[PDB]
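Box 3.1. Reading complex inputs
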Amino acid sequence: HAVEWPVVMSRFLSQLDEHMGYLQSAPLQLMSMQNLEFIEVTLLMVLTRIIAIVFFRRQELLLWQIGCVLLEYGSPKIKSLAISFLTELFQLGGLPAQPASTFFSSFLELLKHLVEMDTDQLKLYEEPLSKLIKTLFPFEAEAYRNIEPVYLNMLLEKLCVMFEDGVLMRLKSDLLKAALCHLLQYFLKFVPAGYESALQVRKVYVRNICKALLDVLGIEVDAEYLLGPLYAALKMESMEIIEEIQCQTQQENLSSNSDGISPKRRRLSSSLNPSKRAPKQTEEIKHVDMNQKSILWSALKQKAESLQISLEYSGLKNPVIEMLEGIAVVLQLTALCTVHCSHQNMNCRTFKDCQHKSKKKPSVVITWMSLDFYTKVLKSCRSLLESVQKLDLEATIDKVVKIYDALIYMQVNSSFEDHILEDLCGMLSLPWIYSHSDDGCLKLTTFAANLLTLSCRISDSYSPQAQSRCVFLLTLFPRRIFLEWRTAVYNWALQSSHEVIRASCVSGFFILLQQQNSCNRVPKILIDKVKDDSDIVKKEFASILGQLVCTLHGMFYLTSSLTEPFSEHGHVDLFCRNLKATSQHECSSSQLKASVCKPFLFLLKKKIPSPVKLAFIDNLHHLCKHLDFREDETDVKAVLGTLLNLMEDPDKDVRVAFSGNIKHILESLDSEDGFIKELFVLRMKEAYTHAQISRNNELKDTLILTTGDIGRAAKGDLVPFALLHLLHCLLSKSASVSGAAYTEIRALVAAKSVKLQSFFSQYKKPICQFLVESLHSSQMTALPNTPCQNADVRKQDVAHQREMALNTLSEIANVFDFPDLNRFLTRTLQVLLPDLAAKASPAASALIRTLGKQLNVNRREILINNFKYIFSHLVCSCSKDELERALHYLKNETEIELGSLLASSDDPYQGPRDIISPELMADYLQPKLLGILAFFNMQLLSSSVGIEDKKMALNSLMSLMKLMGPKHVSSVRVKMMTTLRTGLRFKDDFPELCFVTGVEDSSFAYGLLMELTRAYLAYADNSRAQDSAAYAIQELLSIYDCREMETNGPGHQLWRRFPEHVREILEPHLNTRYKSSQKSTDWSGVKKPIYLSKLGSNFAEWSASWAGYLITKVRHDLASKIFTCCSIMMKHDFKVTIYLLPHILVYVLLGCNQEDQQEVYAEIMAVLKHDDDLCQLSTQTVFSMLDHLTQWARHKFQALKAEKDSMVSTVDYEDYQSVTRFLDLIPQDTLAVASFRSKAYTR
Amino acid sequence: SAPGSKRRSEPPAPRPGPPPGTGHPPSKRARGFSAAAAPDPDDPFGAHGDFTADDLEELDTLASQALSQCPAAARDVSSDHKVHRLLDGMSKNPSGKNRETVPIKDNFELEVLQAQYKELKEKMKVMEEEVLIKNGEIKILRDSLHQTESVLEEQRRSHFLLEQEKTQALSDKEKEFSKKLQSLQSELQFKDAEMNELRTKLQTSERANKLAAPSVSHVSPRKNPSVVIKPEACSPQFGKTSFPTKESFSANMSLPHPCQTESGYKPLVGREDSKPHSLRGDSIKQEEAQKSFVDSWRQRSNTQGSILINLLLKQPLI
Amino acid sequence: MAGTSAPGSKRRSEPPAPRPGPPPGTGHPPSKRARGFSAAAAPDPDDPFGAHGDFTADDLEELDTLASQALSQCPAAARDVSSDHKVHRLLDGMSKNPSGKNRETVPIKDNFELEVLQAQYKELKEKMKVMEEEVLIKNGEIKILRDSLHQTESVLEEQRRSHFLLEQEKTQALSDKEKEFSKKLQSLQSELQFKDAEMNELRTKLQTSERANKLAAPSVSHVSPRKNPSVVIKPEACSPQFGKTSFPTKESFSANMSLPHPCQTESGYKPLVGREDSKPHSLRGDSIKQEEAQKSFVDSWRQRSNTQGSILINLLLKQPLIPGSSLSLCHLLSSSSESPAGTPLQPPGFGSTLAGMSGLRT
């Protein structure tokens, strides 16, 4: 308001700073800026301030957006449309606001493209703008950006033209172009010799306007025909304009060269229309000679008027760009002889003192986009010019053209890259790598095929270049990040040596280091980090982890780089990367052994913490808490893999004590367990007696006193490294206590039982190559005994493998196991009766070719195993699994084995199908047998004869299991169970005639002791949980806490239903575990709500966990086992809790703080009432637990009166009082109405 | 069927055009309290639990027009207490619908521009209801205006005796620990929350923030070494304002013997790289020509920040 | 329930009070023309649906006259005539939407009066282009209350005949009486709208008045002057106003026939005969009242209308042959002369039309 030239222009800056802060005050500046734009519309004076207020127009160019009030913008927009209507003060504006008005009209039309909905008024303002713009085209004085924004609006008018469906007619801008189509000819032909030079220069851009429009639009058929009329009649006007250029060639030789450059820009305009398809270069090749008529200097110098009109036309660099346009028009004209000779005439000039480098870009596009020579020789003709360009000291001049030359290749396999890369990066390490940084970035776009075999200099250039990219250090981030797109085209072998050269560069980065290169090397580590999807690069990421160990080491910018590298490791972490953490941890442990080697300093108090702090960092970089021991399982094995001369022994004697209660004799047991002491030794000659002396330094080695089964487990761990490297070391492993080679086979059968422990090792973790080694161990097992006796459990252990990943190498290994089945069962194929079902089981999930060959190996065995009795016959049902390959012909050979090796027959066939239907070995086999039963039922009109008077049972048993195995479903078996019943009759009930609860009635008797069969409850329940697989580690480690809960001899060994799970229990019978900590953190009234107010998934189990937190003062014997279950059920299944939950309330309400029996009661009522899925599932639990109490009271009250030790039993009768008193808190309608609400109803 | 937002824009368009006409701002409570029956007293029934105008249709957002009416005529105490017993009737009770997210923001933004305008105390009781009605899993815009919500209240929550400031000592950057924000505006929501963090002296920061949401802001800032570009024109200034947070940590951790950072040398790691990039924020080209505000970001807001780089080297040195 | 939608009517008036506080802003209304453009934002968006919606401002309420009230706010001050053009895009769009609301189901009646308020407030060509729009979009097959809005279309054209040469009256001379033959018709207000249509016949001048009238319309108006007292009732001031408008409308051919006397008149004395007796049906009835002091003005109105009829008494006799009658209107002319000589003595008024009527009735 108080707006001087000194005041308002100074006020503009803080206003710009207010704009720089944010936008969107309470709309007051929208009143002010529209007044200020009106003040700018008032502005024609204050000449210093007129440009100084245009500094606000920079902010007004900055504050153009689509995030303002639709009123306050569009009000000022039409006010701008009035300001642009009588924009003579803008048409006579000085310099910057005149430039900013074109920014403002851009700021109009860009923000006009946003959505504020003043629909036709904007189009009325558009016609108000374009008539002002055609007047601005009429009032042509200097500019082109004012035309370009109008051309941006004309492109917007083209966007208005070709929006939905309109054929580029009745367009007022094209009518203004049609008004320009005479006004240009008015400025060309008649009465125009006074001021129409810049008007022609406008008409140049005006012709270029609709030309660039015709290049812009996504065009079509004859809807786009009048969009081709943007130039078609104008081509004759361009033919007039070329004749007018000849009239413009009749210049007075006085400073018209810029207009001639504008005429060249006019010439380039129709060339740019000709640069796209389409419309007749036979017209344009004439103008190409007129384009050639610009210079035509060195060869011809033809006339004197054709000399002086070329001398001033040559100035200064845009004429060489017009020669580069004369390349481009010749690149459009397809007159390659006229192109290359003019390119030779361009090669005749080719120096220009600055301007040839701009002229050489399209000259490098001349012979290339045409591909007028051999596409490998075309590189060298450019490279010979690039040799001159490297000789030119092309400080970004031709280096941009060299950056343009990269994608300009467009036909080269590998070797053209090998020559041309010498020219670029060798200059880049010298100077001017800023443009080469774009060129290296251009290479990531250009690398779609390069570096096939002779890449050992190509990547050696780039690894030198990325090292040289640290010399400016801004391209250091650019270089391999572009190659992060581009180094996918690589193997690992020569890349490792390149990575070794990169390590040599990293060593050079480590050598040439003060603090700057290391930061770039951190980025170069980071650029190597995002360069993933290669194991050698993951080993280079392990070298980057060794650099992260170095980032643990140098600690200045390196610890600053470390977590960022760990974030880069997290950026490399497309999973939880414990896989690569297997062996590479030992490399960092070797770096820790190097840190044990870097422990010569007398820091026995300090380095005992500091190397542990070094061990703390990478483990915290591995982002874990309990990994102090879980990583130590391999790290002590890496300390076992350490030679441990003197520096590692006392380190391990202190670090294990820092790890656990693991003194040098106590952790010698932890060095004996595991036998990776002996197993990961595997380096026979020197270190073994030194390690035994180190074991004498650890445990006073009595090495005969060692666990042979753990050594047999180490023999499994040996045969991992198949085979002779194991088998040589196996002998010394055998001859340690007593054993020998290929021996002992019965101990190898225990090692085959330990192969089931290796299958237990295959159960939880994967390390998938161990199964391939297990097949080699199976090949070694055929080398051991060729034991078909093992093949009962071994094939079952192979069965338990078979879908650990469905990794296709295991399919080859299962074929090898089938070859082992062809090996161990060669004399009999006796187990191949039931292994055919396993062969049916395995080849069910096959979807592979050699599995069909493994099925053809069974069809080989249809000869080779001497196809036989019902081993060969009764497998014919499930055998028909796919019939895709000539497996079908083997199935036809099996149909031969179903017929040639082979009513009441149907009643036998149904009875055959009956045991088949209730088999459900494979779900698909049951689904096949049901599908077999469907067409078997399509043999009806005899089944109705079997439906006589009362319907002749075993038609019943057929129906009986057709319901009984339709108990719930498998997914296709559900709809397969449809054709079970409904294909047959209703069978009214006409012959539908006729011990689960005896366990369930003894389950409350099992609830009584929690000792008798709670074992058979809990352990077998965790056995179902044992195939959580694995996810999480605690879900595995529950079982070891259940092994910590394991106790209680031979009756549990009598409970070995899955004796492999008892073997998995025996596997778990060693490993200590269970560090999952807990507390109360009570919030008990909230817990009374968070029985249901926590989010209902395992929240009742969490309420059970809070009940387990409440389960302190209850019968401490298995309360810890319940607390061991509290470790489990926190991660374990909802079902796993359910087998604890009754006994919990049996435990808790023995005696617990009678006012908090109310809290138990508080769980009950609140879960029912205020809620009503996840509720209703949780309800059934609450039912079920109360039902135990009843029966448990019945077990009590029987024994209360079956007594004639009755003293505490009277206290237990007092408990039986109090528990029944606890039942008298609920009863029962409360429960019953909720059951009516529930899943429903009978309870 | 095709007049949803444009015809609804005509209310404030009528309101602001007459606001941009003439003299004093008693019209801010004149037509508004007349028009206050049209939504709020039109929602006054509260049929349990649903107001009469609010929870029937989505067009109950003339409170944003009332906020636009609050933004209409700015003098000097008029429409706020004129809506005071109306908002104590309506907006006090018809704001804890616990989802509300269709203009739950503009419901608060009505109170925000109210608190922005003038006053001390009537909204200072209303912030207790915002201290009551809060969420940690709000919508991305509902989290966004929430950052503005205590922000407009902060001026009287630092009036003289700070009057509401320790009411959110547990509803502090705990609320900024509703992390994993959305795209760069929701990143800028933290930058406005950083802009909101300028008051409230540093006695008990460990219970309230512990620089841990600021570590989550540093987690954004450790990304911000290369997280943004050309909204870096916002974000590097937000990084320059993140440089104030270390200077704020210099006035807190290097105030008397705390150092405040346990698992945050990893956080101060790329912050030190951002401290390396602090004076090197406007150092790409660095020409001698400046239109209005270009080179002053890493010169003048790095004058204090290169000191704050040395004051990022004060509780834990360089 | 606290209140019904009468509180919304208390809010719509309060929204009209928000429009009145917007009308209590200031002088010249480019911002309200922008609000008329903000209305035109809504007004273009109504027919943009073209499916089961309406002009939502008119579809908001009925008594809420914000379309007139913002136009009343747009009558702030003249700057300059684009405010009288900016709502033209708001005018014809909702008018075509009201034309897209054809047959007037339940909401299209109130549109034309909003258009009439838009016609009366400010149109430079915003009525004339609307008349150019209504030339392309008009349907006149009207009904009872729709006869009033058709006269509101007749109210526009004379108001549009104002500027400098009236600028579209010759274009309005195209819009002639070809649909106006729907008299002997709807009720007293519609007869007052027919008197407004007669006020439109006291308009559309010598470009079309020498064509359209032809003295067979005034005789049809003499049937309407019979109809206005007989085809309905309760027109005590209304037919008095309808006569007072006809007192202007019969005197609308004053300088017309006294320029070159074209006038197309076939029955040039039938309408003057029965209406002058129908004057005595009220004025000699007011001379049967014969009061000196006016009641408030309703006595003074019809007496000034009788003083206007005194000019009409001087009118037909000065040119046409008086006392050439056949019926007892000549016997009522003596009663009109009884009404004359009463009111001539009771005039104390302009002596020119007094003494002429003293020789006209006598």
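In summary: The CA atoms of residues 770 and 1136 of chain A lie 31 Å apart.
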